[PDB]
């Protein structure tokens, strides 16, 4: 967000007194040959460099930052830029003209948090979930305490699938997405229909089934035993996921050999 300001403005002096002096490597005999007008319009630069006025540049180094995180929309950085320039062209001083400098050489460096924001989704995945888990009932359900293993598999899923896995709080009911596409929106305040079977050995509306199928991959010997339903189903969903991988590769193979066809004797 700065070199995009460098690569939007500011067309050096070492590179100029490295060429006039003929200290380059590839073609030293470069500056000598130019017309004796250029060679007298580049020698009086690396002999008495001309000052500059950097405000615009680093101000453009701030706009290109805002509009890349999300404030000032892409189409408004022609009013924001003028407004910022005129503000910093009023109150300017070594005061502000520096306070910028720090802002521009910190905003491009203090981007690690932003990177973190999208590397553990600690923006709407764990802060939301670790909020929703605090809206759950007490952590002592009656039947079993396979509860905690499931509720931890949920956190692991949300933390190890950065894709989007956003956890909205679309009003009273917090709902889990499986991707920004969102074609597996399962309601996470509607598994207070699993605070039923948390411990037993057709009452699951697929919404609950959707959550089970969504996390299952991330369950191993955790939700465990023959803890009824919740146990097996998870195991059966994992088995079905493996079989689905098998059938996926099989169908690609059988359609690369060559119409419903494979879809029948696969499904």
């Amino acid at each position: 967000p700065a070199m995009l300001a460098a690569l939007q403005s500011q067309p050096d002096w070492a590179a100029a007194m490295d060429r006039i002096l003929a200290l380059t490597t590839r073609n030293p005999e470069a500056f000598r040959q130019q017309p004796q007008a250029n060679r007298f319009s580049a020698i009086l630069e690396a002999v008495v460099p001309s000052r500059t006025n950097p405000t615009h540049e680093k101000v453009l180094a701030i706009v290109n930052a805002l509009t890349e995180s999300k404030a000032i929309r892409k189409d408004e950085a022609g009013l924001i830029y003028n407004a910022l320039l005129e503000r910093v062209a009023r109150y300017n001083s070594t005061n502000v003209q520096a306070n910028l400098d720090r802002l521009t050489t910190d905003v491009r460096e203090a981007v690690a948090q932003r990177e973190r924001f999208m590397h553990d989704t600690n923006l709407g995945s764990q802060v939301a979930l670790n909020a929703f888990l605090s809206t759950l009932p007490a952590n002592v359900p009656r039947g079993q305490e396979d509860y905690v293993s499931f509720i931890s598999a949920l956190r692991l899923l949300v933390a190890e699938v950065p894709q989007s896995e956003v956890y909205q709080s679309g009003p009273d009911y917090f709902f889990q997405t499986s991707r920004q596409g969102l074609q597996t929106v399962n309601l996470t305040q509607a598994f207070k229909n699993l605070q039923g079977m948390w411990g037993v050995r057709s009452l699951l509306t697929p919404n609950t089934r959707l959550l089970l199928l969504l996390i299952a991959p991330f369950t191993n010997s955790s939700t465990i035993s023959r803890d009824s339903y919740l146990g097996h189903l998870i195991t059966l969903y994992r088995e079905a996921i493996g079989q689905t991988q098998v059938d996926e590769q099989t169908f690609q193979e059988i359609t690369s050999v060559s119409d419903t066809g494979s879809l029948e004797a696969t499904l």
Binding site: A30, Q34, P35, N38
Partner: peptide, 26 residues
């Protein structure tokens, strides 16, 4: 009628500055 004729590895008008006839300027 025959032409052939030589001189064609391109042209120079080298840079660091650009072409001749002027573009626009009596």
């Amino acid at each position: 009628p025959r032409h052939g004729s030589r001189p064609f590895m391109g042209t120079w008008n080298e840079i660091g500055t650009s072409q001749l006839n002027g573009g626009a300027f009596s």
